[PDB]
Amino acid sequence: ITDSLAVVLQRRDWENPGVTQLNRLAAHPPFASWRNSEEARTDRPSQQLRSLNGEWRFAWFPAPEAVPESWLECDLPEADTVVVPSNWQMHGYDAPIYTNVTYPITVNPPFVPTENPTGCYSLTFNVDESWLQEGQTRIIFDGVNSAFHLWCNGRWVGYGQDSRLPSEFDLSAFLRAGENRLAVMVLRWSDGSYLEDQDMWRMSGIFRDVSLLHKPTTQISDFHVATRFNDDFSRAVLEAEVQMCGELRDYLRVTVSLWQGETQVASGTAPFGGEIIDERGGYADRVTLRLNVENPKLWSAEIPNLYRAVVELHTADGTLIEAEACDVGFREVRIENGLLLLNGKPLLIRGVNRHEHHPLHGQVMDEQTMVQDILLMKQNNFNAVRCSHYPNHPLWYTLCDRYGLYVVDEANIETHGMVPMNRLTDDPRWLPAMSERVTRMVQRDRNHPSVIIWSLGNESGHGANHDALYRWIKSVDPSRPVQYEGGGADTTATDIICPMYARVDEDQPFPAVPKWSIKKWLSLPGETRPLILCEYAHAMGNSLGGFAKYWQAFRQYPRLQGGFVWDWVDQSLIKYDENGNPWSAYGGDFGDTPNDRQFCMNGLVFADRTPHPALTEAKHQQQFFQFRLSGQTIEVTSEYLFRHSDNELLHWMVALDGKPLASGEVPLDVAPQGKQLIELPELPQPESAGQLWLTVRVVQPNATAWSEAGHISAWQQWRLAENLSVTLPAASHAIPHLTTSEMDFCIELGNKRWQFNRQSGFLSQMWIGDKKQLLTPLRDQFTRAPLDNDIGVSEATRIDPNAWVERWKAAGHYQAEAALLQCTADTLADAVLITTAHAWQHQGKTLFISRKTYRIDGSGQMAITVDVEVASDTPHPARIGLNCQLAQVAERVNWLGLGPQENYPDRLTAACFDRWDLPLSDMYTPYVFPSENGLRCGTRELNYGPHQWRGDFQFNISRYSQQQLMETSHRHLLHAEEGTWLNIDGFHMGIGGDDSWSPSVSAEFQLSAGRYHYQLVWCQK
């Protein structure tokens, strides 16, 4: 009767920040109630802990109150069978909504909508009779988004908010023997939604595991591990505080054993009862053991040395009551004197921001995905990661612990969408709620060594509630620093200045919360804290430009400890068409409103873990070994702090314009932070003409837990010498014919035949025999299908006039109109001289002027010269080059230049000067929101079909027009064009990336010189 939906829903606890839980067990580190030390030690699975993940009965409802009381007694009939864990939007119940800042619902704290997409989960399961004999039987929800009610065997059990932490109830007195039934009322929105406004898809459901744990009545109830070190780390104390629950008796004991493998390192035995604490006594129900550990093995991302701590609750005459355990990592995290030191040396954080996202599964994490992400990171020079923006699924910590990644464990608190941002964070009434998102996260995760930094949530501004909460952390877990970015990045509630998107060299003095140049920030009078970017470099689309700029400051300034890239994966979601063929969908593609489109895809890797090009930029910049060449002594520096170049070989190779002349290999013997002198054998020199390049690569001869053998860890390249070509070509054995008309000019030599259109002024066509080549005349181009950075936060509704695209559009770049000023064929000794001048204008403003001379010769080779003028008062061109569409459609592509991967000017460090040969396909980059791509800079020679082009250019080549890319919202809607489109640029503007909602391109990357000159040479084979 008082279990009735009736009576229950009455209260509307989901509409009360002052009710966060109902009948909820205290938080705590992960338990398994083993009853065999050995297993516990070996982390063998627990017979006392049962998963209820799987098939389950679910049924969706528009709102709470539409639920029928029957449901508490018997399963509904239209109740579909579903899988748990899962997100119901992932099942087609409702739409997944992609909103950033803007709240999904209407802002009326603490009120939520009546139309409250409720989902009912149900489950029938049998309990051993043994479970009900003794012990307690509790249940666990690793995450239920957003809030829910719960019932067992028709009776009400409890309530709980906070989608990111576990909720546990004591089922002990409600289950009967054999057949039992669960009734879970997950509400979609609650007063707790006002605290989960993170930038990600908004979904629901029981998205993490569900389990059953049976503990004995007299049990272990919480435990903490602590490690103190002497001055040289040669010795540590392992301190354990153990708390029990149950009636205390003089026979109870507690042993805590430390294991290194099979070998028992230290063991301690003691009976309950703590030291005096106050005028009343101590905890009788606690005990602290201190284990003395000598010349311990330290944990780092560099070497994840773990131990196993087993905690046993037993009697004096040896009977074992139960065991628990955790991995132990001996590390000291300390901010000393402006520096964030780990085990004494000052860290350099090469990390990134990551969400729990699966294109397919929504926000359900699995062991495989986890593992995958990590190895990729690890493989790409990542050290650390941030749980942006909530505590993650439990296994995560264990993988980082085991594999070696520093984690910044972050509280599930984000109220971005409030005005001001502080509205709640600064409201005493929201104290309790936040409080619990902080306290429980700490109490659950505090034993993992990977966690080295606790965060207070994200963009919630700065409120008196953060100060209190941070004070709490400091008080309870002095082992780690706390940090929080809200309110200006330097508030009193952070131990680190941790801004997002601060620029290296340029300031953004916004009212109340500016963004000083990072280097500048450190010296602001007063200031002495380390600076570590909590978010920097927007991996959004074609991005990561300027990346190096960052890597370089980090390296020159001590107090700049690196930072976290935004972000790892594309929060894109899979959809299917009129033929069950899938495609990658983004915000509002689910009819979701309001939404924020592509804004959800800022990763370094596709949502399927296939990497984006930027990823290599990161990998090279983040590399652990640095080099400098001096004569033929290569000096190698270790950027490792703890480890030794003990699985690395140096590959060196000397080449002349793609031709290898020499190679050798050296094993690295650099200590962490150390140097290593390498002298190379008298290097070869050719009489032959062309650039000599030196390329070194670092290799991992042996596999690791996260890398393959022969994995390349780092690299670097130097141009050695240039041997200028002073050989004037053989003055062609014949001369070219010219034939004229009023329409065009035609040049003929062999089967070769060109033709210029006297009207228009461009090479309109060319034949190699009865075959034609162009489908499109060859004309100048000064635009580009805009990148995400170019567009930014501009929308047809609302226009961002400062955004590049807006600027170009406005200036008429996109709709210019050529004009033939001149076009002249002249005849020379052994050549033909075509000569043009065109003027680009929009509304009687000459935007540009392109002056040119084609000079065909008896070898059947034309030499294009271009000389453009750009008006000082026009937004600087995205680019400056030529383009055209050929007919050939060849399988490969081969050039002598940077690559093999897509490189743009402000992002080209990870690339190498070589002779690359790829499939055309690899020439297009499958960004989900089409835009200019696949460019390759620094090309000296291109080759496709029978044509070859030569000189100093940037180029790109696909079967998509710059214009097709630009009028297509999804990569899935692109269609190949008739032949190959070619873009040959003498010049290309930067890509930007510092952020995607304002102009990121740095001056040196902008094309603002007014005069450009470039040459080409086209020819065939």
Distance in angstroms (rounded) separating the CA atoms of residues 83 and 373: 24
Q: Which of 324, 356, 459, 932 is catalytic?
A: 459
Which residues, in sequence order, are bridge partners of residue 298?
330
Q: Which is nearer to Mg ion, 191 or 617 (CB)?
A: 191
Closer residue to a copy of itself, CB minimum distance, 485 or 914: 485
Q: Hey, which residues between 397 and 416 contact Mg ion (CB under 5 A)?
A: 416
Which of these segments, 276-284, 688-696, 740-748, 864-872, binds a copy of itself (CB under 8 A)?
A: 276-284
**Residue among 312, 410, 535, 617 flagged as catalytic:** 535
The answer to whether residue 703 forms part of the interface with a copy of itself (CB under 8 A) is no
Q: What token pair was written down for 161?
A: 């908010």
459 is catalytic: yes
538 is in an annotated binding site: yes
Window 428 to 487, contacts with Mg ion (CB under 5 A)? 459
**599 marked as binding residue:** yes
Residue 864 contact partner, candidates Mg ion, a copy of itself, none, CB within 5 to 8 A by sort of partner: none
d(C-alpha 918, C-alpha 809), whole Å: 35
Token representation of residue 958: 């696909």
Q: Is 998 in the site for a copy of itself (CB under 8 A)?
A: no
Q: What are phi and psi of 618, to 5 degrees?
A: -60, -55
Q: Of 354-362, 426-434, 810-818, 998-1006, which segment contacts a copy of itself by CB under 8 A?
A: 426-434
User: If contact means CB under 5 to 8 A according to the sort of partner, which of a copy of itself, Mg ion, none does residue 513 touch?
Assistant: a copy of itself
Q: Does 455 bind a copy of itself (CB under 8 A)?
A: no
Q: How many residues does the chain have?
A: 1021
Q: Which does 21 bind (CB under 5 to 8 A by kind): a copy of itself, Mg ion, none?
A: a copy of itself
For a copy of itself, what does the binding mask look like between residues 501 and 540, x meaning CB under 8 A?
---------xxxx---------------------------
Q: Cα(535)–Cα(982) distance, rounded to whole angstroms?
A: 37
Region near a copy of itself per CB under 8 A, out of 342-350, 466-474, 627-635, 928-936: 466-474
Q: Which does 199 bind (CB under 5 to 8 A by kind): Mg ion, a copy of itself, none?
A: Mg ion
Return the sign of the alpha-carbon dihedral for residues 642, 369, 43, 454: positive
138 is a contact residue toward a copy of itself (CB under 8 A): no
- Provide the strand spans (E) within 62-173: 80-84, 97-99, 118-127, 136-141, 147-152, 155-160, 167-170
Q: Does 199 bind Mg ion (CB under 5 A)?
A: yes
Q: How far is the CB of 275 from a copy of itself (least distance, A)?
A: 8
Peptide bond into 729 cis (omega under 30): no
Pairing of strands 349-353, 560-566: parallel
Cα 458 to the center of its chain, rounded Å: 17
Residue 174 near a copy of itself by CB under 8 A: no
Does residue 20 belong to the site contacting a copy of itself (CB under 8 A)?
Answer: yes
- Does position 19 bind Mg ion by CB under 5 A? yes
Q: Which does 233 bind (CB under 5 to 8 A by kind): a copy of itself, Mg ion, none?
A: none
CB 929, CB 948: distance < 8 Å? no
Nearer to a copy of itself, 118 or 439 (CB): 439
Q: Which of 3, 12, 16, 25 binds Mg ion (CB under 5 A)?
A: 16
Cβ(200)–Cβ(600) below 8 Å:
yes
Q: 997 labelled as ligand-binding?
A: yes
Count CA atoms closer than 13 A to 755's CA, side-chain side.
17
Taking CB under 8 A as the rule, which mask of x and - marks residues 427-446 in contact with a copy of itself?
Answer: -xx-xx--xx--xx--x---
Q: Is 110 in the site for a copy of itself (CB under 8 A)?
A: no
Q: What are the residues whose beta carbons fall under 8 Å from the beta carbon of 586, sequence distance 6 or more? A: 98, 572, 573, 597, 598, 600, 601, 928, 929
Catalytic site residue 78? no
Task: Write the burial class of residue 185 (CB in 10 Å: 0-12 exposed, 13-18 middle, 19+ buried).
Answer: buried
**Whole-angstrom distance, CA of residue 482 vs CA of residue 732:** 74
With CB under 8 A as the contact rule, the residue among 54, 281, 684, 710 that binds a copy of itself is 281
Least separation, in Å, of the C-beta of 693 and a copy of itself?
47
**811-848 CB burial, b ≥16 within 10 A, e <16:** bbbbebebeeeebebeeeeebbebbbbbbbbbeeebbb
Residue 811 binds: one of a copy of itself, Mg ion, none (C-beta under 5 to 8 A by kind) = none
Stretch that binds a copy of itself, among 224-232, 289-297, 419-427, 616-624 (CB under 8 A): 419-427
DSSP code, position 593: S
Query: Cβ of residue 489: shortest distance to Mg ion, in angstroms?
Result: 14
Number of residues counted as binding a copy of itself (CB under 8 A)? 58
Q: Is 188 in the site for Mg ion (CB under 5 A)?
A: no
- By CB atoms closer than 10 A (0-12, 13-18, 19+), residue 916 is buried
3-state secondary structure 381-406: CCCEEECCCCCCCCHHHHHHHHHCCE
> Where does this chain touch a copy of itself (CB under 8 A) — which range of 480-488, 561-569, 647-655, 820-828?
480-488
Report whether 536 belongs to an annotated binding site: yes
Asked if residues 595 and 587 have their Cβ atoms less than 8 Å apart, the reply is yes
Q: Which is nearer to Mg ion, 196 or 994 (CB)?
A: 196
Burial track 730-767 (b if 16+ CB lie within 10 A, e otherwise)? eebeebbebeeeeebbbbbbeebbbbbbbebbbbbbbb
Q: How far is CA 176 from CA 130, 219, 536, 859, 898, in A?
A: 11, 23, 54, 94, 70
Q: Are 942 and 685 in contact (CB under 8 A)?
A: no
Does position 478 bind a copy of itself by CB under 8 A? no
Q: Establish if 607 lies at the interface with a copy of itself (CB under 8 A).
A: no
Instruction: Show which residues are catalytic.
Output: 459, 535
Binding-site residues, in ranges, read 100, 199, 414, 416, 459, 535-538, 595, 599, 602, 997
Binding-site residues for substrate, in ranges, read 100, 199, 459, 535-538, 602, 997
Binding-site residues for Na(+), in ranges, read 199, 599, 602
Give me the residues that bind a copy of itself (CB under 8 A), please. Answer: 2, 6-7, 10, 18-22, 26, 275-284, 417-423, 428-429, 431-432, 435-436, 439-440, 443, 459, 461-462, 464-465, 467-472, 474-476, 486-488, 492, 510-513
